Amino acid sequence: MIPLQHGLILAAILFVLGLTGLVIRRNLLFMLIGLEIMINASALAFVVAGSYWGQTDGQVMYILAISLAAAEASIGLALLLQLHRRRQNLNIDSVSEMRG
Amino acid sequence: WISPELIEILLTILKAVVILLVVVTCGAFMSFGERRLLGGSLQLVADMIKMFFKEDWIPKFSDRVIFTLAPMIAFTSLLLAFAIVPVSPGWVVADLNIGILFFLMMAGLAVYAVLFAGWSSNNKYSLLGAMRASAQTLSYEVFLGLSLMGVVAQAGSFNMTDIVNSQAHVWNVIPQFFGFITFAIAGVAVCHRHPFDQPEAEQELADGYHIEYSGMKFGLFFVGEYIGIVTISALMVTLFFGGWQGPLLPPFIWFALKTAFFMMMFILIRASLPRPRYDQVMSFGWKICLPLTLINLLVTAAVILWQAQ
Amino acid sequence: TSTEVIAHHWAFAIFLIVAIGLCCLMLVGGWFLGGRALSAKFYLVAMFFVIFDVEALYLFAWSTSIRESGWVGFVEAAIFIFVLLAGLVYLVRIGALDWTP
Amino acid sequence: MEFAFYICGLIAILATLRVITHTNPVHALLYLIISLLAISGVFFSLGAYFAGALEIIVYAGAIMVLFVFVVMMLNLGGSEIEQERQWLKPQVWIGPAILSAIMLVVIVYAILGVNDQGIDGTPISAKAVGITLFGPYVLAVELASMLLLAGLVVAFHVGREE
Amino acid sequence: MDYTLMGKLNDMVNWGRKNSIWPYNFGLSCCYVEMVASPRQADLMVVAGTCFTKMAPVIQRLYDQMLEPKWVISMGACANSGGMYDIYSVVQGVDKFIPVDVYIPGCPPRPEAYMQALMLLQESIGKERRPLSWVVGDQGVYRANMQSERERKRGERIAVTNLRTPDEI
Numbered sequence: 001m002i003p004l005q006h007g008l009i010l011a012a013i014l015f016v017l018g019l020t021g022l023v024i025r026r027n028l029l030f031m032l033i034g035l036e037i038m039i040n041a042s043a044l045a046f047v048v049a050g051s052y053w054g055q056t057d058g059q060v061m062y063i064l065a066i067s068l069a070a071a072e073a074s075i076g077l078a079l080l081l082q083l084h085r086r087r088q089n090l091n092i093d094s095v096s097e098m099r100g
Numbered sequence: 101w102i103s104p105e106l107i108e109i110l111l112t113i114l115k116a117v118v119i120l121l122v123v124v125t126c127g128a129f130m131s132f133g134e135r136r137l138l139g140g141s142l143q144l145v146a147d148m149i150k151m152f153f154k155e156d157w158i159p160k161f162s163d164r165v166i167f168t169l170a171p172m173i174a175f176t177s178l179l180l181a182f183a184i185v186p187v188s189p190g191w192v193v194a195d196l197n198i199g200i201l202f203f204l205m206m207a208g209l210a211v212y213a214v215l216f217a218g219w220s221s222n223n224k225y226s227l228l229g230a231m232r233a234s235a236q237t238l239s240y241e242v243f244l245g246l247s248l249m250g251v252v253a254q255a256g257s258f259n260m261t262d263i264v265n266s267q268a269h270v271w272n273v274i275p276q277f278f279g280f281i282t283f284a285i286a287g288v289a290v291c292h293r294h295p296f297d298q299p300e301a302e303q304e305l306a307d308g309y310h311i312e313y314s315g316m317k318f319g320l321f322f323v324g325e326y327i328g329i330v331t332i333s334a335l336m337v338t339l340f341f342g343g344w345q346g347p348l349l350p351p352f353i354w355f356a357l358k359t360a361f362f363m364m365m366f367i368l369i370r371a372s373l374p375r376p377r378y379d380q381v382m383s384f385g386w387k388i389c390l391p392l393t394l395i396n397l398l399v400t401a402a403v404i405l406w407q408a409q
Numbered sequence: 410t411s412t413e414v415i416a417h418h419w420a421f422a423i424f425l426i427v428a429i430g431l432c433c434l435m436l437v438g439g440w441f442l443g444g445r446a447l448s449a450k451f452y453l454v455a456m457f458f459v460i461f462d463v464e465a466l467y468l469f470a471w472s473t474s475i476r477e478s479g480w481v482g483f484v485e486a487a488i489f490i491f492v493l494l495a496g497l498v499y500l501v502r503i504g505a506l507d508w509t510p
Numbered sequence: 511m512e513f514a515f516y517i518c519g520l521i522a523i524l525a526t527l528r529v530i531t532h533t534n535p536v537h538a539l540l541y542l543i544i545s546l547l548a549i550s551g552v553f554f555s556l557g558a559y560f561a562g563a564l565e566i567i568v569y570a571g572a573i574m575v576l577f578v579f580v581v582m583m584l585n586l587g588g589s590e591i592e593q594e595r596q597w598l599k600p601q602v603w604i605g606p607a608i609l610s611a612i613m614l615v616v617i618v619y620a621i622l623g624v625n626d627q628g629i630d631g632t633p634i635s636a637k638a639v640g641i642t643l644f645g646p647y648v649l650a651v652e653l654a655s656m657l658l659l660a661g662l663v664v665a666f667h668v669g670r671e672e
Numbered sequence: 673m674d675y676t677l678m679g680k681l682n683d684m685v686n687w688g689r690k691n692s693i694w695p696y697n698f699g700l701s702c703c704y705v706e707m708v709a710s711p712r713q714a715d716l717m718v719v720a721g722t723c724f725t726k727m728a729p730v731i732q733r734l735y736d737q738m739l740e741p742k743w744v745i746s747m748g749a750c751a752n753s754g755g756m757y758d759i760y761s762v763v764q765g766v767d768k769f770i771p772v773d774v775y776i777p778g779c780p781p782r783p784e785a786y787m788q789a790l791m792l793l794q795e796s797i798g799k800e801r802r803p804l805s806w807v808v809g810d811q812g813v814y815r816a817n818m819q820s821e822r823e824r825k826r827g828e829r830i831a832v833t834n835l836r837t838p839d840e841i
């Protein structure tokens with residue numbers, strides 16, 4: 001009784017909001033937060049699609065998605081801590097040394 | 101306005117409310133019992149009145165929402181985790197298909213009370229003590245679920261009534277003994293009970309996170325801790341000691357006897373055991389209890405698959 | 410859509426609502442009444458918790474369907490748990506889980 | 511299950527909109543936790559019970575705990591970003607908001623016009639997910655263990671103190 | 673009795689504050705070691721020891737950190753008046769800078785004298801009027817002028833005739 005279009009539109013809205021947060025925020029922590037919003041939105045879209053078809057593959061894709069989300073959040077926060085302890089500054093525009 | 105469907109839903113709602121009120125009052129009475137063993141109901145009512153009519157002082161340099169939100173989490177997390185516990189046939193709040201997973205959800209949310217209290221209490225020492233306490237609770241929440249997973253493997257489902265029915269012949273304390281001891285250790289360590297009381301006592305650069313909480317927020321932390329040990333005891337009963345199943349007594353009598361026995365045993369091991377060092381606690385968790393839960397799950401699966409012709 | 414399931418849904422909803430409202434009312438009554446007048450090891454243990462919690466979720470999914478998967482599922486989960494334990498042994502031996510070096 | 515889906519989707523959208531435009535990291539992480547709980551309620555409304563349970567257990571109970579840990583240990587007390595609030599200036603956010611709105615419009619136009627019998631919302635249990643996970647998706651499980659090992663090794667090598 | 677600057681529940685509030693008293697025992701000096709929670713949670717401060725000038729600010733600060741309603745019990749001659757130390761480095765009494773509700777003579781007092789002081793403080797709490805809320809009603813605290821313990825106990829004390837001789841144990 002819940003349309004597939006509505007669930008996919010909700011997932012698309014969350015994905016777009018996470019991408020906007022990734023773009024407009026200069027702090028690296030908020031960039032990681034936007035990345036987490038984007039990957040959670042894509043996982044929600046997989047769950048919506050799997051629930052529409054009555055298949056378990058959507059939740060399996062969700063499980064792989066959140067495995068990726070956990071591991072890359074760990075890596076990104078480790079790199080954030082390294083940047084903080086090497087520069088005392090989380091500005092992502094300051095770490096821009098290599099240029100064309 | 102008379103219909104048996106409305107009567108049924110009203111009676112189920114009334115049963116849920118009765119269960120909730122009995123759990124809260126039992127948590128308060130267990131706080132009284134620990135304070136006395138280490139009228140009384142009138143003294144607890146006096147304590148509640150005093151904490152109500154004492155002024156609630158939020159610190160000036162403290163974040164109000166996080167400071168207010170930490171005791172709410174500390175109460176409501178395990179108080180809501182109780183909702184899956186079947187105390188009697190026909191006396192369960194929610195017959196959820198996820199069950200013990202709902203308990204794991206609530207414990208994972210329960211770590212936020214410690215983190216939020218430490219951050220909002222604007223003090224570096226309190227922050228460091230909360231970081232140590234949260235590291236300890238993560239170190240034991242890492243294997244809480246697997247210690248339950250042995251029993252889940254034996255039952256074949258996450259539903260609690262199915263676990264109670266699968267303990268009809270032999271209670272799960274006998275086959276899942278290592279799951280039982282690991283779940284007891286993890287449940288004590290998640291609720292910050294003795295011997296995992298004060299991880300900040302190993303350093304003078306740290307302080308407890310309950311400091312700067314005055315009056316009703318401190319009361320929320322106190323009653324939330326005791327309600328947490330009540331629901332941990334009830335989960336222990338329903339997962340390892342048959343739940344409500346017994347030969348002669350009514351089922352609620354058996355469940356209440358086992359839960360009261362486990363609450364008294366938690367009081368006894370608080371009064372008896374000494375607290376180990378912090379690094380000893382972390383090493384014991386990560387190096388002993390997690391591999392023991394994994395090996396117990398493997399052995400349980402092998403025994404189940406062998407005993408299926 | 411039976412009577413029992415909707416009764417338990419209403420009972421669970423009332424349990425959650427009355428619980429959260431009881432905590433809220435406790436704080437409201439406390440506030441209204443009465444007169445007036447770091448180290449990187451924490452990151453390491455939290456990250457280890459996250460990784461081993463995801464691997465625990467895989468074992469959560471396995472544990473509820475052991476009989477339906479048979480011995481083949483046992484072999485696959487045994488390989489999973491072996492890789493998990495080898496990672497744990499590696500973390501212990503390199504001093505990652507050693508709190509006092 | 512319909513009203514729950516719509517109200518939880520609304521709460522999730524509002525919470526993440528508050529996340530991306532907030533200055534306090536702990537407040538933003540709290541709103542992110544609220545959005546994750548709302549998304550778990552969305553999962554429960556669609557019958558994906560295992561997915562909602564893991565959304566609270568793992569996403570709102572492990573990953574966001576790691577984020578809160580990092581925020582608390584770095585102690586963001588307004589290090590030359592809170593006192594500026596450059597993302598609230600129109601020239602910084604107006605452009606990317608237009609770009610994201612265009613992307614959302616194109617995606618939503620693609621969503622519409624697709625045949626839809628509706629989501630049944632019937633509960634797909636964790637037993638069925640476990641059967642599929644250790645049945646036709648075995649190598650996914652084993653290489654996901656390898657993926658988490660890779661993340662573990664990378665995060666230890668980069669994030670250790672010495 | 674006179675008082676110095678809707679009824680049943682006020683009595684219940686006084687009963688709750690009376691039967692629930694969480695003390696903060698300040699060490700200070702030998703009175704505490706005879707007798708042997710955070711100041712935010714405590715509602716009673718028991719000052720028992722010599723008020724030195726170097727830690728009178730410590731006493732004042734830890735008293736200011738407490739939250740209303742708050743009561744003070746001063747144990748021993750040092751906390752009452754300075755005691756035997758009328759000297760340059762000693763504040764002559766706790767009540768020089770913070771208000772004291774109950775005084776106990778002695779050097780040191782016995783622990784059951786501290787229990788007696790707790791009983792007296794319980795009566796004083798039970799016979800006092802405090803504001804119910806910070807938005808409704810009068811925001812004034814009415815301490816009751818209790819009859820002194822020496823006027824109350826005068827008859828039984830003066831009636832004493834003979835005592836045991838000090839030649840025995």
Ligand SMILES: CCCCCCCCCCCCCCCCCC(=O)OC[C@H](COP(=O)(O)OCCN)OC(=O)CCCCCCCCCCCCCCCCC
Nearest residue numbers: 173176195196197198209418421422425426429543554633
């Ligand atoms: C300050 C307040 C902050 C917010 C607090 C919480 C807000 C919401 C409170 C109102 C809730 C209203 C009732 C919700 C529905 C209850 C019934 C329900 O969930 O039923 C659905 C499902 C039933 O499953 P089952 O019975 O097994 O099978 C039937 C076959 N279809 O059962 C399930 O799917 C069960 C799993 C879902 C259970 C969710 C429980 C609440 C989780 C959030 C806790 C928040 C804790 C405090 C804050 C933490 C930090 C932010």
Ligand SMILES: CCCCCCCCCCCCCCCCCC(=O)OC[C@H](COP(=O)(O)OCCN)OC(=O)CCCCCCCCCCCCCCCCC
Nearest residue numbers: 410418511513514517518521544547548551554555556631
């Ligand atoms: C009310 C206005 C807003 C007020 C503030 C926010 C409060 C929380 C609002 C969202 C959560 C409650 C929504 C209402 C749920 C009511 C119960 C319901 O709809 O149950 C139906 C269904 C039961 O399952 P099923 O068996 O499939 O039903 C068909 C029957 N054959 O149920 C399901 O399938 C699943 C039911 C939902 C999942 C469980 C609850 C999730 C809670 C998420 C909380 C998110 C954080 C909220 C924070 C609030 C403060 C900012």
Ligand SMILES: CCCCCCCCCCCCCCCCCCCC
Nearest residue numbers: 119122123126187188191350352359
């Ligand atoms: C510490 C224990 C907490 C228990 C909380 C729930 C209490 C529920 C009480 C239910 C009582 C009636 C049970 C059904 C009838 C069988 C027993 C009859 C004699 C009491």
Ligand SMILES: CCCCCCCCCCCCCCCCCCCC
Nearest residue numbers: 479480481484485488648649652653
């Ligand atoms: C039905 C009874 C079967 C008994 C024999 C079971 C053993 C034979 C089949 C084993 C299959 C194991 C597959 C494991 C794949 C691991 C891949 C790892 C990739 C990194």
Ligand code: SF4
Nearest residue numbers: 702703748750779780
């Ligand atoms: S009154 Fe006597 S016993 Fe008490 S602190 Fe003073 S000197 Fe010590």
